[PDB]
A paper describes a structure:
AarC-[name] lacks the carboxamide moiety proposed to contact the internal oxyanion formed during thiolysis of the acylglutamyl anhydride intermediate. The mutant retains appreciable (~15% of wild-type) specific activity. A data set obtained from a crystal grown in the presence of CoA was used to determine a structure in an orthorhombic space group. All three regions in subunit B adopted the closed conformation. Since AarC-[name] retains significant activity, our hypothesis was that a polar group would simply supplant the missing Asn347 carboxamide and restore its function. As anticipated, an active site solvent molecule was observed at this location in each subunit, with a lower B-factor in subunit B (HOH 775A and 787B: 58 and 34 Å2, respectively). The solvent substitution, however, additionally appears to influence the conformation of Glu294. While Glu294 in the [name] mutant adopts the tt-0 rotamer observed in other closed structures, its χ3 value is unusual, corresponding to a rotation of the attacking oxygen toward the mutated residue (i.e., away from the CoA binding site) [Any value of χ3 is permitted in the Glu tt-0 rotamer]. The resulting misalignment of the key carboxylate may decrease the likelihood of productive nucleophilic attack on an acyl-CoA substrate and affect the reactivity of covalent glutamyl adducts. Without Asn347, Glu294 moves from a position suitable for nucleophilic attack on an acyl-CoA substrate by a carboxylate oxygen syn lone pair to one better aligned for attack by a less-basic and less-nucleophilic anti lone pair.
[name] strain 1023 and other acetic acid bacteria use succinyl-CoA:acetate CoA-transferase (AarC) in a variant citric acid cycle that is required for a robust acetic acid resistance (aar) phenotype. Strong selection for key roles in acetic acid resistance and central metabolism appear to have optimized the structural and functional properties of AarC, making it an excellent representative of the class I CoA-transferase superfamily. Class I acyl-CoA:carboxylate CoA-transferases produce reactive acylglutamyl anhydride intermediates that acylate CoA, forming either an acyl-CoA product and a free enzyme or a protein glutamyl-CoA thioester and a carboxylate product. A closed active site enables AarC to engage, immobilize, and desolvate acyl-CoA substrates and to stabilize covalent adducts of Glu294.
Author numbering:
A (entry chain B): 2 to 505
B (entry chain A): 2 to 513
């Protein structure tokens, strides 16, 4: 079953090594790939090998790598090992690339995922020399069918001077038809178009990405799997978090502040948000609808149990066993999933209009409910902000989820002051840990503190937090958001110095 | 001429004092008022008097005060002096109210101005007992014509149990027609409506606020002026900032990254703004368009010259001289201005669609370009975040402007780490001080730092900043966003302890 159904384009098929030779040192390369789904694989490997060879000969050979979101070991992993990426945007989860970033060997900036397409069109990343995009198939009309994610692929195809397509036989042919690619101006030159989405399950586009065939310089036939980590089966900590939130939603419904079927759900990357979805798959809320950035195992379970009717997202983020599950049951799931451009799925105008409920994980929050999603001790990148800002600020309800402690209790997830801020107080209304739920709506900072400390803090750390806060109220420069600047960041320094936030 | 053209409502006219008696201890009160414009005046004054009298007899008397944005002396000032506000939102510029907030005598939360209506409808502030709105006139069918701002007035009218109107004859009658009020679902229950604004000069609604006449409990005839602030005449610092920004606009135009008429302009509230508006007034760019929260003296002038074709905002932000140059020629300016609900003028979907250029002031930024707009030393409130968040994140271009120092040079506006964050790195692309302009587009945090330090920081503080950065690069826990947590906030603590961020030479400092 020929995947390249356009006859004329078959003449552009060539090996990965030859194709990679189109990528020059200094090139800006835009690729498909979103949370371990749909990134190119074979051309990156071939590139990485040639990069290492060139480095030994003393030839500079690095690229700027712009993606949808995070990719996999074949892309981020291989290129980082080869020391071949001088700039990376906007999101990564590969350990080797992360090490490059945190060692200052690769420059990194995690843009709001929903803005990357627009900033690319604006020229923020420079001119795109190459778009490297993985496809399920190429239609007779020359349409490019995406794989397990859409990401920024349409925008990258538009901008790039040259186009390389990887047609991956591994990807299920029945992916064709699952995507919704819109013809309108979302992230182009102002004035942009109104995106006529008024329901999360509404399609407004077509099944294929469009590209001038004259720009396609090479097509590489591939056969290699998406690779992403499994999710942690929800333990007692995660299940407690799920329990608190579901109870919360329940009361909201009883008070008629939410409909019985809630509102369109966004669930972010990570184990905790996934654990919540596992809770929802057997919860008291029916006819649920997903308007998310990614579909993780838990959301897939919800569609399976029937609690969720349909899920909109830009990408899959499935475990190896979940991915294998959906590709055996593509018949069932295909009619319940819509994969959109990432600048549509994370469009603020749409998110607010739909009234999405945002559920996201976090590194830490301070007592006033400022949120760190990214930088441990304020300097060491974990993954990136992703679309968490897109959704948190635009949502009807912004909810953040975390164990109250980290690293076996040696770190408190509730701190005097966040070492880095991704989400300001105004962007966070609800906090949930295994200790309880803090509802911050309508509260001043001092009021937010009392709630967060009492409800969410771990018993090991709560008195220390209360000690900080009470002395801050006595001594702070101002009393609106009381701080003791001499010790605001001292818990983080203590961890650095001793390996634990707990004093001796 | 009679301002109340609806006969039936005329019998609800009563004195300010009588009207104020409707407001009871513990009430949530929603009022009109936005950047010194269109706030109620006489009822709050009477309310404050009765509050003080109660307090003098050991009787509690306080309200929750929710507004459009900042008000004026007759409202925030009077009530703060009376200590009659237990909770305040979302924005304040009154000195007395600011003292109450910073002493913890008034609880305060500065929501995004564009989100306030929605959060009120959600019930975040509780049940609204009273709506108190200033009006230019009341039409034949009972429509309420706003005055010099729209703010959240329509939402407050919908929510409140009882309504009080102040009909202010100081406000020019020809304000009627300048407002655009939508009956569509902007900030109500999901699913909300598409707000179909695709041009900055587009009207989608009507000229009046709508309210059930049965809820109007009192109408007060008033005659009192809006009270804002004198003209902030641009100093050499502000002029320098304006100069650098205009050079930047010029360059973007020549590289075809902006059209010759630029894009719809949002100008923040502040003194640096006028310098920029003055600059645009004499600049090379024609057919300018305003899509902002406020309309300042500078915008008025460009509208007058035809330099700017239209200005959309939620409110006036004028000097007293500007307040009546426009009330002499309201006839003229009413055709050049559209005043919208603030949840429309600060709507993210619309701001992004129109591709607005956002220009806002700041307290400080750290070397990595995270921005503080609100809390001095991290704990003391200035004004509030306002709509700066609405615009900065949604804009086509996000620009922040500030003197490179504060308090006669004793504070650096560029610091190792911001004491508080309102706008994260991702929400800020351009920084401008009197020292220069930093273009941060496409840069990593370390790259952002090299630009901000070399272009924007004051020469008095640059070697200190470079020293912190250099040693952070060597020693930071991670090297992606290098920090020394031992001294990240030490400059702020230095100011608290000694009144200056500059170190003494009686002790060692690495940059020496
Ligand atoms: C913040 C985030 C890392 C949390 O992940 P999670 O899987 O729910 O939470 P976990 O408790 O399993 O923690 C994951 C990792 O973060 C670390 N971590 C979490 N909180 C921490 C803290 N306070 N201090 C230090 N490390 C912390 C854990 O140790 C773990 O790292 P490790 O496996 O190397 O030991 C993740 O949600 C994220 O990257 N968010 C940003 C993107 C986003 O939210 N996008 C939303 C739209 S799709
Ligand atoms: C941040 C803000 C206060 C700056 O105002 P501005 O007029 O450009 O700037 P100025 O340099 O005149 O300073 C304003 C005040 O802040 C103080 N200030 C500014 N930077 C400071 C700093 N780094 N440290 C301490 N104080 C500082 C000034 O001393 C002055 O205070 P003062 O009245 O006690 O003397 C103002 O823009 C603001 O409140 N912004 C938030 C609202 C907003 O942006 N809304 C969206 C647009 S409608
Ligand atoms: Cl839209
Ligand atoms: Cl709130
Ligand atoms: Cl809209
Ligand atoms: Cl950028």
């Amino acid at each position: 079953t020929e995947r390249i159904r356009n006859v004329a384009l078959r003449s552009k098929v060539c090996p990965a090594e030859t194709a990679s030779e189109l990528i020059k040192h200094g090139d800006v390369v835009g690729t498909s790939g979103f949370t371990g789904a749909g990134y190119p694989k074979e051309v990156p490997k071939a590139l990485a090998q040639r990069m290492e060879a060139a480095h030994d000969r003393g030839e500079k050979y690095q690229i700027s790598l712009i993606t949808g979101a995070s990719t996999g070991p074949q892309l981020d992993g291989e290129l980082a090992k080869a020391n071949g990426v001088y700039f990376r945007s906007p999101f990564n989860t590969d350990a080797t690339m992360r090490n490059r970033i945190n060692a200052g060997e690769t420059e990194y900036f995690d843009n709001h995922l929903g803005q990357v397409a627009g900033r690319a069109v604006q020229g923020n990343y420079g001119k795109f020399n190459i778009a490297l995009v993985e496809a399920t198939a190429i239609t007779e009309d020359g349409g490019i069918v995406p794989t397990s994610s859409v990401g920024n692929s349409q925008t990258f195809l538009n901008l790039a001077e040259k186009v390389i397509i990887e047609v991956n036989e591994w990807q299920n042919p029945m992916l064709e038809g699952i995507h919704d690619i819109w013809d309108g101006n979302v992230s182009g030159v102002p004035t942009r178009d109104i995106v006529p989405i008024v329901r999360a399950d509404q399609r407004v586009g077509g099944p294929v990405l469009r590209v001038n065939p004259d720009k396609i310089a090479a097509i590489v036939r591939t056969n290699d799997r998406d690779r992403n980590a499994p999710f942690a089966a929800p333990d007692e900590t995660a299940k407690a978090i799920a329990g608190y939130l579901l109870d919360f939603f329940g009361h909201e419904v009883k008070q008629n502040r939410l409909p019985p079927s809630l509102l369109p759900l966004q669930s972010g990357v990570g184990n905790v948000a996934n654990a919540v979805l596992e809770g929802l798959k057997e919860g008291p809320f029916e006819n649920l609808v997903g308007y998310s950035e990614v579909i993780q195992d838990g959301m897939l379970a919800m569609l399976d149990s029937g609690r969720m009717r349909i899920a909109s997202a830009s990408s899959f983020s499935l475990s190896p066993e979940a991915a294998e599950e959906i590709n055996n049951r593509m018949d069932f799931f295909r009619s319940k999933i819509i994969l959109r451009q990432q600048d549509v799925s994370a469009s603020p105008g749409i998110i607010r209009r739909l009234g999405c409920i945002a559920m996201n994980g976090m590194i830490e929050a301070d007592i006033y409910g400022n949120v760190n999603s990214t930088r441990v001790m304020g300097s060491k990148m974990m993954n990136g902000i992703g679309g968490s800002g897109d959704f948190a600020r635009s949502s009807y309800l912004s909810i953040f989820l975390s164990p109250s402690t980290a690293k076996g209790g040696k770190i408190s997830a509730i701190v005097p002051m966040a070492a880095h801020v991704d989400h300001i107080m105004q962007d966070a209304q609800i906090f949930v840990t295994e200790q309880g739920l803090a509802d911050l709506r309508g509260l001043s900072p001092v009021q937010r503190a009392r709630e967060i400390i009492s409800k969410c803090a771990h018993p090991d750390y709560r008195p220390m937090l209360q000690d900080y806060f009470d002395r801050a109220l006595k001594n702070s420069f101002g009393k609106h958001t009381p701080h003791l600047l001499t010790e605001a960041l001292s818990w983080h320094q203590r961890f650095i110095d001793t390996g634990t936030m707990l004093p001796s």
